[PDB]
Paper text:
[name] alpha (ERα) plays critical roles in the etiology, treatment and prevention of the majority of breast cancers. Selective [name] modulators (SERMs) like tamoxifen are antagonistic in the breast and agonistic in the bone and endometrium. SERDs competitively bind to the ERα LBD and destabilize helix 12 (H12), leading to proteosomal degradation, while SERMs push the helix into the AF2 cleft to block coregulator binding. Here, we explore whether bazedoxifene (BZA), a potent antiestrogen that retains some [name] properties, shows activity against breast cancer cells that express [name] somatic mutants.
X-ray crystallography was used to reveal the structural details of BZA’s antiestrogen properties. The 6 × His TEV-tagged ERα-L372S, L536S double mutant LBD was expressed in E.coli BL21(DE3) and purified as described. LBD (10 mg/mL) and incubated with 1 mM BZA overnight at 4°C. LBD-BZA was crystallized using vapor diffusion by hanging drop in 33% PEG 3,350, 100 mM Tris pH 6.6, and 250 mM MgCl2. The BZA ligand and H12 are well resolved in each monomer in the ASU; poorly resolved residues were not included in the model. Specifically, the C3 methyl on the indole ring of BZA appears to shift the core of the molecule away from M386, L391 and L428 and towards H12. Interestingly, the distal phenol on BZA appears to form a hydrogen bond with improved binding geometry to H524 compared to the distal phenol of RAL. The core differences for BZA broadcast down the linker arm to alter its vector towards H12 where the azepan ring now pushes against V534 and P535. The alterations to V534 and P535 propagate to H12 which appears displaced out of the AF-2 cleft into a less stable orientation. An X-ray crystal structure of the WT-BZA complex revealed that differences in the core of the molecule translated to an altered vector of the linker arm, resulting in contacts with the H11-12 loop and a perturbed H12 antagonist binding mode. This less stable H12 antagonist conformation likely explains the [name]/[name] properties of BZA, wherein it allows H12 to adopt an antagonist conformation (like a [name]) that is somewhat destabilized, although not as destabilized as when FULV is bound.
Residue numbers in the entry:
A (entry chain C): 306 to 460, 465 to 545
B (entry chain A): 306 to 333, 341 to 460, 464 to 545
Write the structure that this text describes.
């Protein structure tokens, strides 16, 4: 299946696959220490991962890949997905990050953790960028799907078949995005322009994830990347 | 200024801005040759930048910032372009074609090499054209350090996004004249722009790889950049 859908079926399939908004532990001794805050954020991210995989498996064409490739895609994209999710729910809160409804953090508190405020500022500018573009929910949900499939599709006859499949679904998601823009009343020109502006944003988000990884590795954190087994286990 | 140009005038201007292909100063250390080569490519990269439609409409500090963020990506998409027609190899210079096996001589590099070779295959499979390539490089210059507060800064970011809108039209136009449908047009546009994300990934991996060894400084200096822009 997965290539039969209309654009409208694609949006709906993606909208219902959407993960829930999770909460931080309701037990914080606010104000924070650098360790307490990294503890709450880490705990949150760990719980978001399980819903992320479940979401991934409901993304059109994702379960058609081999389990090994599914793991590979998730290995590359997991932090990017976290980040575009974070910036999305932070849109209506300028100068703040909404990790959880009970964990809205301003810029000054990011500076509690060494080097995080640098990572923090990139995230805010991106949220602001989404706000100025008036990014819509269907567009976001599409952009997130693109990140999942694209971040690792740069890695046999089987192997080329899996990649052309991935590129087939991505062209469909591209079709879906254009369709959404057409019914909004944008011209052929505004359609190509807006599509471009959205994808150029993914480039920066890739940069943010890259910086984020170094920051996490810089806090000498315990076991940053999810491991092949944990990803494989959660996928079954 | 540049917001007035047609797609074909945009392409023509960018094709004429293209830097020369430089040579490795070889013999008849490998990091020595590559470092030396990259250093000489930088001056022409700046000359190229100043001739990209709308780059000189910006302030010098803003030009420096863009070049500060994009320089390694530009080097890399340049390398991948001239390596396209040489499978399993990357052409740093006409007298310096290297396989993965020779990249594996230098520590931690074989990973970056594989990423770069992978980009070449992708360009090759897409039949990426010189005109498209030349458009993609300009986008890298303008887009990589745009996300970064006076009224002037706001005008700067609006100009950059207007010029970026222009190259999108330019890219779409090229695809139309090649005979692709409207649907094939936005698909290829998407495919090209999504590749830029990977190049950003390579660029960051590249920096970490460069810091893992020595340099005088890895990032070019603000003054030198401001100096080179003259
Ligand atoms: C973007 C983001 C981060 C993050 C990003 C960059 C940083 O420098 C710091 C935090 N954080 C906090 C954070 C991000 C990543 C973390 O990795 C910790 C370990 N877990 C990864 C999921 C589990 C198996 C692997 C290890 C731990 C905490 C988020 C939490 C929720 C969320 O929606 C978004 C984020
Ligand atoms: C892709 C690529 C590399 C490269 C270097 C290190 C890696 O780990 C992977 C690829 N290199 C070699 C190289 C690239 C960048 C380098 O940066 C450090 C040295 N001088 C760098 C530039 C600003 C002025 C000061 C620093 C040093 C070596 C290329 C050279 C030319 C070229 O067209 C492409 C490349």
């Amino acid at each position: 299946l997965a290539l039969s859908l209309t654009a409208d079926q694609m949006v709906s399939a993606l909208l219902d696959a959407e993960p829930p908004i999770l909460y931080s532990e309701y037990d914080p001794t606010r104000p924070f220490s650098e360790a307490s805050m990294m503890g709450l954020l880490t705990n949150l991210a760990d719980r978001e991962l399980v819903h992320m995989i479940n979401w991934a498996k409901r993304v059109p064409g994702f379960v058609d890949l081999t389990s090994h490739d599914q793991v590979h895609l998730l290995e590359c994209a997991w932090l990017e997905i976290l980040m575009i999710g974070l910036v999305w729910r932070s849109m209506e809160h300028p100068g703040k990050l909404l990790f959880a409804p009970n964990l809205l953090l301003d810029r000054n508190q990011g500076k509690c953790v060494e080097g995080m405020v640098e990572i923090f500022d990139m995230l805010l500018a991106t949220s602001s960028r989404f706000r100025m573009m008036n990014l819509q929910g269907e567009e976001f949900v599409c952009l997130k799907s693109i990140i999942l499939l694209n971040s690792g599709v740069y890695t046999t006859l089987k192997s080329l078949e899996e990649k052309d499949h991935i590129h087939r679904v991505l062209d469909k998601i591209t079709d879906t995005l254009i369709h959404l823009m057409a019914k909004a009343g944008l011209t052929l020109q505004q359609q190509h322009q807006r599509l471009a502006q959205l994808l150029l944003i993914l480039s920066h988000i890739r940069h943010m994830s890259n910086k984020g990884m170094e920051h996490l590795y810089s806090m000498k954190c315990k076991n940053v990347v999810p491991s092949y087994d944990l990803l494989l286990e959660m996928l079954d």
